[PDB]
Swiss-Prot record, chain B:
Protein name in the entry: Erythropoietin receptor
Disease per UniProt entry: Erythrocytosis, familial, 1: An autosomal dominant disorder characterized by elevated hemoglobin and hematocrit, hypersensitivity of erythroid progenitors to erythropoietin, erythropoietin low serum levels, and no increase in platelets nor leukocytes. It has a relatively benign course and does not progress to leukemia.
Portion of the full-length sequence here: 32 to 247 of 508
Summary of the function given for this chain in its UniProt record: Receptor for erythropoietin, which mediates erythropoietin-induced erythroblast proliferation and differentiation. Upon EPO stimulation, EPOR dimerizes triggering the JAK2/STAT5 signaling cascade. In some cell types, can also activate STAT1 and STAT3. May also activate the LYN tyrosine kinase.
Effect of mutating S82A: 10-fold reduction in EPO binding
Effect of substituting S81A: Little effect on EPO binding
Swiss-Prot/TrEMBL site (Required for ligand binding) positions: F83
Impact noted for substituting R145A: Little effect on EPO binding
Glycosylation sites: Q42
Mutagenesis or variant effect for S142A: 16-fold reduction in EPO binding
UniProtKB/Swiss-Prot annotation, chain C:
Name used for this protein in its record: Erythropoietin receptor
Portion of the parent chain present: 34 to 246 of 508
Tissue: Erythroid cells and erythroid progenitor cells.
Domain (Fibronectin type-III): residue spans on this chain: 112-211
Record organism: Homo sapiens (Human)
Site for Required for ligand binding, residues: F82
Amino acid sequence: DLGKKLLKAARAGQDDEVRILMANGADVNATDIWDATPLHLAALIGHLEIVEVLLKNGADVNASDITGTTPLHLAATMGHLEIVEVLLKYGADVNAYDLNGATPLHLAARMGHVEIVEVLLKYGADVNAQDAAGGTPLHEAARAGHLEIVEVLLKYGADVNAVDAAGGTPLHEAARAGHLEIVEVLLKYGADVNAVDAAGGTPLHEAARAGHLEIVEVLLKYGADVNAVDAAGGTPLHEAARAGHLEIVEVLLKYGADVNAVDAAGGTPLHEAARAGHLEIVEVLLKYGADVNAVGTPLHKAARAGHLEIVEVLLKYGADVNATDIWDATPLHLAALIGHLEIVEVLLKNGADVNASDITGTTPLHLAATMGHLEIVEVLLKYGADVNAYDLNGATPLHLAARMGHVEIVEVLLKYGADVNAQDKFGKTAFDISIDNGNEDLAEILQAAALE
Amino acid sequence: DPKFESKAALLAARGPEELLCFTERLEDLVCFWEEAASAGGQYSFSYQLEDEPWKLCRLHQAPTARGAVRFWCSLPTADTSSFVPLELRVTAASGAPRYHRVIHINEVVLLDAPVGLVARLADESGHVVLRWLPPPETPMTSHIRYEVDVSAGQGAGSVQRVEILEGRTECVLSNLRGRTRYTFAVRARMAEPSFGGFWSAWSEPVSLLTPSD
Amino acid sequence: KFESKAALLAARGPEELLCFTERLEDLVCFWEEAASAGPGQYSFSYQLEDEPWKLCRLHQAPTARGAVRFWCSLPTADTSSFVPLELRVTAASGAPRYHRVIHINEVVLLDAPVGLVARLADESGHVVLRWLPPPETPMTSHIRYEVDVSAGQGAGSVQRVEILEGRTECVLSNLRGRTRYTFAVRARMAEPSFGGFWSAWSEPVSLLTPS
């Protein structure tokens, strides 16, 4: 009863009220629902007057709650230098750890309180402490990006090449976040510029992945491998064209990155840049000498997405206009399916096969009539599309246009010589599906063109 | 599954004989098509993501409507990624072409019907104030566009249909005749340009009788 | 709306639990974390004075670059000003993530003011600015303001005048003539009973002063 009245008052910070409870007979170290003593709540709010009277009148300075957090941990996380110095003078555990394994130096470096960092190190804090993740306080300082904490930790004896469970180094966290001020300092003290984590990524990989041109140039000046390969087989040039950082792509290429490097999937930077849609990067990769026709078919995915500018550049550098994929489908098929009039005009003008069929037997005119792209059907027939071609179901472009119900395209097909008398594998004609579905508008045109 | 059936019926009535794909949320994606019942694993569903290899989905056969079978497949949540062209291909047992489409997950959003529809008579001129809430457990609240339908009670009632601008969940209707029962219902869809899709089902109707001018 | 406000606070203090309230009725706490590998990962717990511990619904939303923002909106009925609110974010295993004790009245983040009107005064006054408080916001008499006098040509940051609490208009001095000035007003809850952060700038209103 009286103990719960103290922790409720210590949380509200009534200094004059608390001193009355401590003298009447309230337990100084009462257990909360989460097992937090009143000293915890006082160190969190930052009431220096309550913190001192608790320790002077006897209190648990090394108390551990249900999460493992100690009173010194709370004062180091919030950043109360006045309370931190009071706890340490009253016999606080300078190197305590919670359930995560975070020491007071870990939390102070992550939040970035340089005054609290220097006081803990001067009191006897292990600069190379490792938590459950295996990272030093320099890792937490490099991930957050505090320059002065990094300079202090390295001066006391931090491990510049510390490795955590995932294999990351302090240089990895700094290159992945984007703080060049600490990257140069880490490299000045002596960092492995080509460190490899469990995923095989180097600091140059994480830097080019985020887009920090300033860090990429600094890493390369300290001897970074421009063609490093990770577990996925991707170079820093892969990560650069994957995200589209033109400044990094141009720097890596001049330094000697391999524009034809293949990853585990089978993709060079060009297949990533053309898929992501970066006209600026695709032009630069092809100038240095990217293989425009490699395994992966970038012209297929480019014409499928609708990057008209990229499809033009790919063909202008010598891409195969009649390339084949897994389904033996040309890029003209996807362009006519997605309904891109401009790309269809570009592919056909570069020499696309207008009567090409896939494994199922569908031609670009088959796909264009099923979707209903009137503009594309017009252009395809102008280049010599087979108006009476059939697939494995025996369906002509007139068969598909009638089943989906496109009157304008049936008008164009008949103008180019569509055969209404044709039968499919079931025996039905173009006029048969018009009655099976229930469209008298389609039957009006078919019945006049069948006889004459 | 109980709500998936009601949602598939709305799309099938709009556009039969074609492959229909919809997503309640960006994470999931379901594609189905209604085909006439064959007494005779007949089809194979193939999908491909950006910078990823071709994979196959599990096909499910379910009979519905009158003498029809609805083949549907639910793509894995991990393979779904929005703002990416998804190439779909349905191939027959022999290798015949059934369907071929390239869709974007963010463009085939089918939201749920809105709830909390409340109609009130305004003291000014005799208008009606409608207030509704977005569909339950749906992200991107600020990007939902609505559409209310003012139906006339007697005879064929479809006099008024007002489009609501995205972000607001209430409107004040005007030009209603007195001594007439108007029934209201609100639609929902994801607004352009980053998101597209189809109109959702109508909310639970709310009827109100107007006084005499 | 809420997204634009949260982005300002994250830029001020990342890696830290941030709680704000647009109006006295509501309260939203969020935090942006880098790690995404491995929604039910964390549990949000809050407790009022002389009240039992309760848990809030956590929502996961991706934002920024390869980051996820876990945010929770406390119930409007549980919101109470001038009361210590103990918050604790616990991991799935039971590990400590965040622990803070804040007062709702001290983390107020108001909306931008509206109705900014600039007028040229014929008297010794220079320019007369009149604005209105943010729409539908309580405690009107306790809002403090700050106007920004920006210079038209080049880098404009000449003057920033603090307005006394309670008044929504000011008469500016020490401005050069024949210069196009752009004005915008800030808003925050004045000390000591209320604390918080500066709100976003209002819609700018430009006016040119005579010679």
